Design an enzyme around this catalytic site. Structure first.
Site, mmCIF file in Angstrom:
data_model
loop_
_atom_site.group_PDB
_atom_site.id
_atom_site.type_symbol
_atom_site.label_atom_id
_atom_site.label_comp_id
_atom_site.label_asym_id
_atom_site.label_seq_id
_atom_site.Cartn_x
_atom_site.Cartn_y
_atom_site.Cartn_z
ATOM 1 N N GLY A 198 -30.182 13.853 -27.623
ATOM 2 C CA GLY A 198 -30.534 14.991 -26.649
ATOM 3 C C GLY A 198 -29.311 15.454 -25.687
ATOM 4 C CE1 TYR A 238 -28.340 5.190 -24.893
ATOM 5 C CE2 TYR A 238 -26.609 6.602 -24.079
ATOM 6 C CZ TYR A 238 -27.295 5.319 -24.131
ATOM 7 O OH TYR A 238 -27.098 4.577 -23.022
ATOM 8 C CG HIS A 253 -22.679 12.170 -32.687
ATOM 9 N ND1 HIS A 253 -22.774 13.283 -32.036
ATOM 10 C CD2 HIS A 253 -22.021 12.329 -33.807
ATOM 11 C CE1 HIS A 253 -22.327 14.333 -32.696
ATOM 12 N NE2 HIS A 253 -21.873 13.811 -33.624
ATOM 13 C CG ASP A 254 -24.272 10.806 -26.716
ATOM 14 O OD1 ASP A 254 -24.499 11.438 -27.398
ATOM 15 O OD2 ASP A 254 -24.791 10.254 -25.544
ATOM 16 C CE1 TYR A 309 -19.017 15.184 -31.695
ATOM 17 C CE2 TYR A 309 -20.661 16.216 -29.920
ATOM 18 C CZ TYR A 309 -20.127 16.278 -31.280
ATOM 19 O OH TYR A 309 -20.720 16.908 -32.247
ATOM 20 C CG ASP A 351 -20.228 16.540 -35.408
ATOM 21 O OD1 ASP A 351 -20.360 15.721 -34.687
ATOM 22 O OD2 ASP A 351 -20.052 17.816 -35.555
ATOM 23 C CE1 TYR A 387 -17.894 20.017 -39.240
ATOM 24 C CE2 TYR A 387 -17.768 19.979 -36.604
ATOM 25 C CZ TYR A 387 -18.506 19.473 -37.795
ATOM 26 O OH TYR A 387 -19.577 18.877 -37.776
ATOM 27 N N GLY A 446 -26.291 13.804 -23.047
ATOM 28 C CA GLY A 446 -26.040 12.753 -22.261
ATOM 29 C C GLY A 446 -26.759 11.586 -22.823
#
Lengths: 5, 121
Positions: free
Chosen positions: B29, B27, B47-48, B51, B89, B64, B31
């Protein structure tokens, strides 16, 4: 800084 | 955006968000699919998913601001999308730091066919 995740 | 997350990751773990964490496991990378390989891969999967809960937000390009309260990551007030992207993040950066001891180089550039099975968010 650079980039990923 | 990616610039804030990468700087966040470098500050927290000492490692450059590229290369350490852009082709790690199943994961970290772009997708992802299958079963996460280890604690650090689960940080990416979570994290994915985080998002994933922000459909009309653009996490990779929407910038940000955040500050350090002596070590703590405090997300600055911005648009509702920026606030929520920042919390996804910050969580990932802390999760990576929490699992630095099990970070394994054998999972860098991990082949796609070894990512099997299913995990729903």
């Amino acid at each position: 800084a650079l980039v990923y995740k | 955006s990616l610039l804030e997350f990468g700087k966040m990751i470098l500050e927290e773990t000492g490692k450059l968000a590229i290369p350490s964490y852009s082709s790690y496991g199943c994961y970290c990378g772009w997708g992802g699919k299958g079963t996460p390989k280890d604690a650090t891969d689960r940080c990416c999967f979570v994290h994915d998913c985080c998002y994933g809960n922000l459909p009309d937000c653009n996490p990779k390009s929407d910038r940000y601001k955040y500050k350090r309260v002596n070590g703590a990551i405090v997300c600055e007030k911005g648009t509702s999308c920026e606030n929520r992207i920042c919390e996804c993040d910050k969580a990932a950066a802390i999760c990576f730091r929490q699992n630095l001891n099990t970070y394994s180089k054998k999972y860098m550039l991990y082949p796609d066919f070894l990512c099997k099975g299913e995990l729903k968010c």
